[model samples]
Target: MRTGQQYLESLRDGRQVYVGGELIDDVTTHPKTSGYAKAIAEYYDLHLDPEHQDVLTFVDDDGVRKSMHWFLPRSKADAARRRAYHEFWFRHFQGGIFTRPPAGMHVVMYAQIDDPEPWGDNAVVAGGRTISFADNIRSQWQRVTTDDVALSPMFVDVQFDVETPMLSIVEQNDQGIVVRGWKAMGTSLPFVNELLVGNLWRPGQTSDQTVYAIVPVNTPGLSLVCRQSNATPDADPYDHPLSTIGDELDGMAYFDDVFIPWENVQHIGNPDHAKWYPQRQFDWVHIETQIRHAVHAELIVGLALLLTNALGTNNNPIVQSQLADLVRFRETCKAFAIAAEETGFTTAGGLFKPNNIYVDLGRAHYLENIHNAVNQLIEFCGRGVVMSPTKADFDHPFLGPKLEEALRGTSISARDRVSIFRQISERYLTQWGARHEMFEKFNGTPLYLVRLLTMQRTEYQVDGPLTDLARQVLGFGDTEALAARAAEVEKNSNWASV
Candidate 1:
């Protein structure tokens, strides 16, 4: 597997990455974005950590160690194994922000449905399908995972109140396509080896819009305009610690007649393909999310406990209740993931994707609780989470002793107690945590939409078999069909029976 230094070196390509309205010459060294590169490399460096090496990878057929992220799970055991990988990787940061390097590899994994060129070279592979890109995809997966190359997903084009789509293909030859447009919020682009233009939009290609592809970030004419830098560089390591090191960020990705090669392009404007591509793979995605969430929730519980102890508030019934609430949230997220994996079903391609119903329900539960839990942490931690002094305050000549004495608890020393509070406040009480409050509010698929997908993914077709089963079980004999004539007007056509 690749080392952290190798991952940093691979990003030296001349990708036009802009931050603060200026071109960043090298992301690995740039003042605005380099810490993120360090954090991304740190994720790779974990591969070399003997502590996590066993859980981080598996020996493939070639006896080479490979990241669990690239493993196209074939069974429940494999999905559980992948979940373990995320559990370890997520805590590598404070509370992990999504890195999404695996997403590119995931796209390549399921994207073989598009006919491979040089046809008839097909052969059997994972998912029990015959496809020629097996070796092609395997090599790319190996390069990124084993070489420890970083990847950033620049998908989900977010257009403001504008007339045009964020990105559209203007022209193409057999060799490649010329793309011209803007795509926003390409998270963590400065630190990655390649840019994956994701496929979620479909504005109608007949209307001459919407396609998906991937390319190196340094590809000519491709530029990134980042949001403001929030790296807490000058702060003591004691200050908002994780935010100091690994704030995975997003920026606007712009294409000025960018050339994306055929080899790099995942698809053209296949509306059906774009919609289905990520959906087909989200079983794995949700599993990863849930595992990390379990860890994240556990971390918060630990923090809340620490805060209560430092505040001498652990004995308060309210604080104990709050701690219990966090425990419940942690266990719930963990349970959802475990249940989903165990109950998962295999795809037509022979891969075991999570049960969509369980995955949807699990995420909805976690998203709801995540918002509530962040607030709960703030409340349980009390005023100290907001009222703590910085490390500098303790180091000052006069205020240092005064603040230390004032900050002390019955059980802990003054300086030590304040340090603990700072750690809690930085992540759970500061603007960092406050933004995280809203972040959780909109965290995942909305509840209403998740219900819709749950219906779609569930086996309850409400058709012939269901009708017969209803007749036998619920004794609704000869139940007539419920639909009325489509042309006829109803009270409200959009309304469904309760």
Candidate 2:
């Protein structure tokens, strides 16, 4: 595994990353991006730390210890270890905002390479030589697993009004395909080693716009224009702990005729197979996401309880009821993940896979409740959430004593009370918090589309068993006339269903 210092050194590569319309020379030291870089760097170091090595790394049959993120689970016990890894990692980060966390994307990579022959059957001509997508998938997966690269995904196109210009192949030759256009919503691009580029919204069956490839962050002619910095670089750690660590910097990636090597291109010009990308890729990937959110919900509930107890309102029936509701939300989020993994089955490739229906349903449930969850946190904490004093105020010679006396809770000291509220404000009331709110709102597929996926994932039970149960309750029988009528209707309605 790579050390924290090595990870930091990797960012010195000449990737054209920009913020506030100015080029950032080094992301690890840049004021706008360093916080996130350092946070990720620390995480890398933690993986190698003596104490955490047991939890995050396991010894393989080759007598080599490897990060759990790259481990391919072949049994329920292995799956449990992977889950334990995410539970620890996500809790350590508080919440992961990246839609494509490295561990999550690892599953997609393994899934593709598990049966690469079918999905990667197409061959693309580059540099006067034919290269197969199947070969690329296996090669790239081996490369990534060996190097332990941190990858962030760029899956959506920039909406330039209704035109929505997409990343397209500009030229194809020996070196690779030249790509141009824009992709966005790529969170934490500055801190990652590579960008997984693809169109989640597959446009057409054979359109040039439909391509799936992996691009290094520092590819020539490619630039990352990051959103405005949200970190309070100068704020006291007590005043803005979360922001001080760094907000997940989202950005729009501009591919200015960027060259991609053929070996890195997984699939090109094939939406026929890519259309099922979500269902296929996210079968296991969604489990990582659900676990991340489950830990996040756990934090939110813990915060609510802590605040209520500090305020001496834990005994109130109203507050207790509200706390119970938050607990239900937290538990339900966790239960969905448990159900997914516990009821999971081994894939044809001998990998243990989570239940898709449970995963998708859990994701939808989390997205829909984001706003309500934050609102409940605010209500539980009361007006002090907005009125909390900053660390500077407490440090001031004149205001320090005044706030100390005014902000005291029932059992906690004034400074501690204000500190808790400051944490809450940064989490739910500031620009940083609002970014998380919006991130949850649209990060996954939209709520409506996820509902549709839920229907599709649950079609077996809904249309097969449940429908039969309903027919039985209605006293409908498979008589000769009924069977004939059903067959005739099926024959007449010959159009395909998605």
Candidate 3:
């Protein structure tokens, strides 16, 4: 709804931000962080283009423009639209790092609609009255979504602090709550202007902990201490393309007795169900990640296809087979997403939930195979990935010929050959590439967790109670109408009705 520049200006509100052991006077203009900030700025600007308008925004009944990512889905058709929105929006920046926009996930907001039950479960009821967590998200979102605001979800907590009571809520007042604590880290911190903090609960045993709220980055007593930037803007984009524009930055967000107004509060000292909020709505977040994994997988497979051309293994049977394996992995993930939407069901709160079983299965399939796919891509590219001449060597007049003589391939020119190999190395051999590898390998807890979820929700649990498949297994064979019945034959037949 607003220009990218508006989002950039909003960041100048003087929120405390630090990087590399020093204060960032202004993140928008900082040398180390600004390239990524600019990339995000470009994303906001993309929404303004007339050609990208339909995929990025649509007019609602209120005659207000809304992001496709935030559209409320009510049916299978709507579910498909939501999936498409995530795909189309993310695909635009595929080779980059805006893979999962925390802003796109205004998770805390949806609960107020028909999904009010989940919000209520996490509502803080204290001093003998029910609180208003859902309305807080709803109202804040109205102002935020209207301008396409960017935000991040801070869910994980520090270890020792986790066991303690949400001591984060150091004090409370008539206007709001004062909280101090360390969030493990928030994704996309430097690129965004706001943060959604707190977990399903506050601190303390038999202590109130629902201290979640949305806070502006510039709010007094708030600061984000970030890790060093991996993006080398000064590096050649030809060798480090993805990181150049898509370094999804992360850092620690510290609230120093920060006062969050009553209006901005989502959950504060809420009851038991508040702790289970994340679990109860597991499918909601799962859908988002699965959509991203699908896009991510598709991107890798595209790379695999391109890798074959670069490695000159187009007709090699084993190479084709390995790439096909990657293809199958991608399609498996894609199929699960489609199946999830088709099998969609509703929550008690009336919010349509994608099939958790399929979505989670899709997640399992993605995480399970991602490591192998990465290795396969790397192995197929062979040693040329490492042996390829740097763009510098290839460009030098004296060294260029020697590098070319050694690197040139059968069909591809030497100049083009090493460039392709360098591209491969940039994605799979560099430090940036390793981080992505670790992400896919340890994503969302562990491999077993997703598998366990799949085992828990799958419908083909035991066997068909009403179909012939189970009967066939038990030697029920088929119906012989001309034959006698069980009483006319046998009783207590496990195979089929007597």
Candidate 4:
């Protein structure tokens, strides 16, 4: 495994491209971008630290130091270990930064490992490809030294047309397959070694559109237009946790007519596998990710509590109410994560099976409640957050004294109190910080989440109670009568009588 410093150095390669207007020849050296690189490097460094090594580095059956996600837990203790691994990282990163990349890496490994066979009818997606996981990670490290890279998946690129290929495989040659189309979001390309491309969307055209491969970010004919966001460093943390981790959110990835080599092609013309990747192995990925989010939310709650206490408002009923709400939101997310783990099964590869229904429900609930919890915490901070002076003001000769005088709390020095607020505000209001919160809020859209909730409600027989109540109101004879009547209608259809 590459050390954190080595990973940061890898970003010095010239193969990647940044925003159209800016030149980012060495992203590691860029002021705004370097912090993220450093932060991630710090996370990597923890893997080698004696105190964190156990949590950060899990041993595979082969006796190699693979990631915790790579291990399929056979016992509840294993699940707790996985949860601890996530918490270890989140506690150090201040909740916003350093989780997504590792989370994506974990999912990619799970998808590749669980389903390597060419997708046939009835082919199911599983999690954990030991070979693919190792190969991708090793190659990824090497690729960073030689090329700018990114991974474009089909999850967000569903637009298909007669003229536009939409990731359709036009033809195959001895060298590779010819792919023509676009992916909706490719966030890693700006500082990656290559673009790892794949389709997670259940393919509509089974024969031609199932594509899974990796390509150079700067490969000829491939273009990407950066997506815009309204988030800035000025946004409130309660409103925007994602903005704190800027440039990690969504981006438009355009692949005009890119040639993907066979070596880089992990899967192709395998619609069944593509379909399974999302609905099957994705459960494990979701389990890992939701746990990470819960860990992050835990930190956010801790920070909010500390800030409130420091400001002498911990006893206020309104502040306590908000704190309780935040705690409840966080606990709800954690409960789903626990349910996902508790209901998991073992996969064909001996990896712990992920409960798809629970994972999806957990992620959807966590995503929905995160925004509310963050918003409540932000409101609780209120004037304390907005009125905090910048660190730069404290350094200024004239402004320093004035800021010190105006910002004094009851017991704390104005300078010390402002400094604390400045750190808190920087996380919420800065461009880099605001991006993190924005990404979290919209990473998974509302419609998709609602669909998942509906699916869970249907799958778990949650609607049975309501149907029974309706039957009683309608003077139906028994539960069987209500079930018989309900069976005639679509499961998700409106049940109101005309």
Candidate 5:
């Protein structure tokens, strides 16, 4: 529905956006945020493109065409279709570096659409009527899908300070509820149409802190204070291609008594229900995350091959061994993504969700190894990544010829060699690259906790089989008695049922 330019025009609204301590007047035109703005806009453009419309857009039962990102997957084939859509965007967006793109919130919201009745159990009272939170969620989903609105979900709060005020309900009148305090790490806030506010994993302490809603980014009293830009806006694409095209801004969203109408509220004054949103939807969200990471792994393998060929190091046995490991890592990521989808189960409401066991395991594996992947890329580039000539230096009239003669690669031109190495530097050596390491490790949860959750989610399948094999090895007999005992143990144990 919406074109690229239309999305850009929508962002010209008086939304409060501050970057580098200066309030940005128009985010679409501002240098600090425009690069990512244009990038996301192009993604929207794919939906209406004549060539890509068939793959990126599907006709709903209502006869309206909608983006695949908003498609409600009911079967495994539908899930596979969604993956194709994801791969399209991920491939175009520099191997999906903008992990918190608009589609991220769509999966989370749509994943939980099947069970809206439970969410309405604790309803919000307003205007002489009880408001159903479940209906609100459904309505919001319809609004976003039909209008093609971009969204960013804010979950992780400013860490470790109970004394510091965080986003909490301050007032709830008939018209609406108002909130104040801070919600940080809202990625790509400036480019989105709305913000999904809720807690992730950790339970809210009180009723005020438990409110969840989808508020428009241009809502009064809400301001996005972004970190200083890491992207080299003026740099030639030859030098910093990745950062120039990829830099999704992360910001602190300070809520100065922002108003959110009951229509926007999904849950209010109910921490119990609030916690269930992410728990019920994590499998869907993590599967999407793995899709993005799988693309990144694939990219790393490609870059490694390119570097080896350019540097004429492909014949070295030690280098080949490292390349082999990179390939293994790439395939492992792909396998997990495919296995999760293949083994996915449908919800009671007939929505397909990726298997939690595989999703969690894959996520843990990715977070643990992505850092090493980056390191290996850097190592393959060698000192060249660190001591590369700039585009300006290469353009020098007198020195250009001499530098080209000296810096020429085994089979590639000098300019192309520098270009590839610069691309590597943009991905692994710059501030933008280093920030991805932090994002990967702690984006959802810590590595140790992810491992702990993976074990918890798969304990029955793993521990039961392993223990049974060990018991048989130790000469246990009476299979009927052992089966009965196992059932009894599972009845009261913490092990999760498949």
Candidate 6:
């Protein structure tokens, strides 16, 4: 519920960090991080805008204007409302806001396993029960959000030994668990109020390695090493549009024996829950992450289409074909997401189910198509995107007017049109911008996504038809007879020369 301004003010805290090799005292004013702040602020602003209020802000049972994510959908109407809520925020800023649109998806997913039993919740809440741990984690999210705590989930950690979980518990005592490890990717730190530390990814039995907790970022012993900034005021927006929005990607997070107080410790040394947290293919929380990517793909397609027209190649066959491909890619992913929510059943926890089939399909398309379409859009814009002159060049005494005149298209004013084009291009084409684009595309990579897809396929019995076909073929009983019958069936084949 923090206003955009409040969110900006939150970043002024003196967290030790580096960007472009200079220490940044205030991230809000720093050029490298400011645009990201602005982009996120826009999302907060949407709640206040009259036209967007209904979609962006929902009244919870408590009558508070909680984010759409906190609302639980009980019917198709509710699902539609949820989708609209996601689309409203997504459309406003294209693909900029980090977790807004998808938060609802995670909330709903986590609610499914909140109960106590085996995959049911008789499985103890503490000892290596991933479902229980996830339930606790999701409950924590709800608690923190309800209390208006700004928090980010810090889950990634370095894996020195493949046999050990990426983030393992090295030590524990009555006060709390002391974790010593390095999480390579922390995406939500720049904007969140606190950090949730756990192993949502580590599979299998818990050893000294797997532990889970939530803690404030300011907690002693927790250190953050932010990734390099690719955005600079100097870069063109077209090539680096992604960076222009914000450097909202992963960073190296180091925890040198960070201490977690008992109150904050949700689950520890329970490998069963740690493995189940991620492996419980039916968990609803997983859907939220997939929905964000789907929304992002939708915005990228629209932006690419707009840029193509701006470059005056809308009618070109090759460009049109590319645009069509992007259109298909974006819409296909959207359909899967919609289908997943619609087909999702109501669970014992009173939360709507997530169609594992649709979730896998939606994520697969996101992981595969985002890079291809966005990169192609960049290529289609070609030199026009990178060659854009800076604001300084526009102010130059001699070259300013000449540069403007030369860059003018047939239908637009030299100065006005080129300036707009330059601004648009500056967002996507700059080194900073391109890095963001690349980050989104390859962020999860093919291996993890493929594994997810394979898991979902197995859970949903997706290959039942193929298995049935194989059974029928094997039951044919005589392979030689089958081959002989096939050999005799030559209606379309020509006779031999003999």
TM-score of each: 0.83, 0.91, 0.85, 0.77, 0.91, 0.77
- What's the residue-level lDDT of 89 in candidate 2? 73
> lDDT for every model?
0.64, 0.77, 0.68, 0.60, 0.80, 0.60
Q: What is the alpha-carbon lDDT of model 2 when measured against the actual structure?
A: 0.77
Residue 353 C-alpha lDDT in model 3: 73
Q: After superposition, how far is residue 30 of candidate 5 from its true place, in Å?
A: 0.9
The digit string of per-residue lDDT tens for model 3 on 144-251 reads 767667767676666563435233676666777787777775667766767777564334433344566778888898878887666777777766666676465667
Tens digit of lDDT per residue, candidate 6, span 1-498?
Answer: 767887777767766555545666777778777776676666666666777667767777767787665566676677678667665555555554444323422343344234423322322333342344445555666676565555555655665544342555666565566777676666646555566565654444455565556767666776666776755554555434345556653466666677876666655555566555544422443465566676666666776676667668889998899888888887887788888987887667665566766776677767766667667766766776556666667668999888878877776655555554454454455554555455555444243765655665544353445355665767652455566766766644776831
Error at 341, model 2, angstroms: 0.6
Question: Residue-pair clashes per candidate, as listed?
Answer: 2, 2, 11, 33, 0, 46
lDDT of 1 by residue, 1-498 (tens): 677888888878787877768788988898677887886677777777888777887888778777665566778887777776666666655555543444323433433433333112422112233323334444455566556555655656664342365677777665667888787665567777777675554454222244545578788888888866667766677767755764555578888888876656545554555565545544445556656678788888888788788777889898788789889998988788778888887766667776666667777887767767877777765666656777787789999899878878888887777666676676665554454444444434567777777666426455545457666786453423233433344644665751
Lowest-sum lDDT 10-residue window in model 6: 116-125
Q: Best lDDT goes to which candidate? A: 5
Candidate 6 accuracy as lDDT: 0.60
* Model 6: per-residue Cα lDDT at residue 440: 51
Residue 63's lDDT within candidate 5 is 99
Give the lowest summed-lDDT range of ten residues in model 3. 458-467
Candidate 2 on 159-212: residue-level lDDT in tens?
Answer: 544223678887888777888888876777888889888766544423566678
Better of 1 and 3 by lDDT: 3
**Minimal lDDT window, size 10, model 4:** 122-131
